[PDB]
Amino acid sequence: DLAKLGLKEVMPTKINLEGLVGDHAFSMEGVGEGNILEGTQEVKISVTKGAPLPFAFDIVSVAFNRAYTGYPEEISDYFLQSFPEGFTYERNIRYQDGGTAIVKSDISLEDGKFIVNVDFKAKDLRRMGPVMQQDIVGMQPSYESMYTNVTSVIGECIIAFKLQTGKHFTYHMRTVYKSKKPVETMPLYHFIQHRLVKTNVDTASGYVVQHETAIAAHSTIKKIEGSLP
């Protein structure tokens, strides 16, 4: 029962990002909606300070809420159980370039609105890398492994930037999600399949608009009857 959590199936959301890439400080904001039972969302991101960006925008795409995840009945939704109070996450990104990024974010609930406040910090970005070169067209779909560690959930992911040369450039992302309150049941090992795309970007607008679909599921390969594990 969603109403008990203080949530409705369709939730608006506002996000404020404070970021520092290299020695460039910036601040962005996002406005969007989404479906927390089915797992869709669309956010309109604009740069409030630091414009223009001397790097690829898509690095902060994952920084712009796992509440928008379609969890089936046979898998417990750790993020929906985490409300009304909300949940936080600490996220570490290692680009195959060798550069790093840290993303710490708080997701709270205010007047039927997901208030997300996120801090982004990247460094050691390679000069000839796709992030500095801005060769990135967008993100490909991904599979984030989710498992339980005591009272928290851990997701690990390989994100792939598609480049205008057709090549790809990956980064390894590990996120520790922590609910603010305890929850009744922790999930078994599973996956969240993601597809994040840029929808209306073709307009000569000064804002990006991204849409993410995320659906949780177990493996679709049958475990041989009595195998290990």
Binding site: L53, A56, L163, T165, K198, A204, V208
Partner: protein, 306 residues
């Protein structure tokens, strides 16, 4: 490819720039070029590269005018300049029209050159063939030397191979590869609409009019498969610049840039080079114009004081 704008109402539209430019008959065509006229005892000639025009320097040159006369041409077949008589736009054709245009400006005995991309190659060749007539050279994202390997270069090997093939002529002559995609991609900010309109205007129609943007990359001086004549030209002027101990130079590296990472090692084997760097990719003029202009201004001042 995303990008976002900056600040708008200091903009110089296309027509605004062109209504300030002059024109002059050169050979069997004509050259369009901006001229600041004042302080004609020195001349700084600004040479744009592929896909661009004199418009590229619009926010750069206001810094250098109070100390010297700055002349900025649209290369032949580009910008508002006329077309080449035989319709060809290889390096030596641009050089022919440019050196003929040089005779009609009543320039000084020694000239300062500010070159970008292929305009830097034109300035380098003119310096090799007129070694005494050069007072100083400023270059950026330049054709510094021949290309023996692709190691530090941006991933453009397959792009160049396609352009040199027959694929290039539907790549650019029909879908405007260098203007519609490469030019916005290599600018850190999002160009205001009329700023991109100014760049697209000379090549807003499909066909041979976009040929200058196809022939420039087919000149690329690779030791393997590159046009042997252009490789010879580049070898010659690179050796000359390596030996030019007395020629003051200024290299404006672009951070992270496009070619700068792959070309600094070579641009650097040239003596008497003051090294500065500004934020941007390839077309660094649209990202750091005022800083670049201040650098060039102080460099020209220091050259003129000694």
């Amino acid at each position: 490819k995303v990008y976002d704008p900056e600040q708008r109402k200091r903009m110089i539209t296309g027509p605004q720039w062109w209504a300030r430019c002059k024109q002059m008959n050169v050979l069997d065509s004509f050259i369009n070029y901006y001229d600041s006229e004042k302080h004609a005892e020195n001349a700084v000639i600004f040479l744009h590269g592929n896909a661009t025009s004199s418009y590229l320097w619009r926010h750069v040159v206001p810094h250098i005018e109070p100390v010297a006369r700055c002349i900025i041409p649209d290369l032949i077949g580009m910008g508002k300049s006329g077309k080449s008589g035989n319709g060809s736009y290889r390096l030596l054709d641009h050089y022919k029209y440019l050196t003929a245009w040089f005779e009609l400006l009543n320039l000084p005995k020694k000239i300062i050159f500010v070159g970008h991309d292929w305009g830097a190659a034109l300035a380098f060749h003119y310096a090799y063939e007129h070694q005494d007539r050069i007072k100083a050279i400023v270059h950026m994202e330049s054709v510094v030397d021949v290309i023996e390997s692709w190691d530090e270069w941006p991933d453009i090997e397959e792009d160049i191979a396609l352009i040199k093939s027959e694929e290039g002529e539907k790549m650019v002559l029909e879908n405007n590869f260098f203007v519609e995609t490469v030019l916005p991609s290599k600018i850190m900010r999002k160009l205001e609409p009329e700023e991109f309109a100014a760049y697209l205007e000379p090549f807003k129609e499909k066909g041979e009019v976009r040929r200058p943007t196809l022939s420039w990359p087919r000149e690329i001086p690779l030791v393997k498969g590159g046009k042997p004549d252009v490789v010879q030209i580049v070898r010659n002027y690179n050796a000359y610049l390596r030996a030019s101990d007395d020629l003051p130079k200024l290299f404006i590296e672009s951070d992270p840039g496009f070619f700068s990472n792959a070309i600094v090692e070579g641009a650097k084997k040239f003596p008497n080079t003051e090294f500065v760097k500004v934020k941007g990719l390839h077309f660094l003029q649209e990202d750091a114009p005022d800083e670049m202009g201040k650098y060039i201004k102080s460099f020209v001042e220091r050259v003129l004081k000694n």
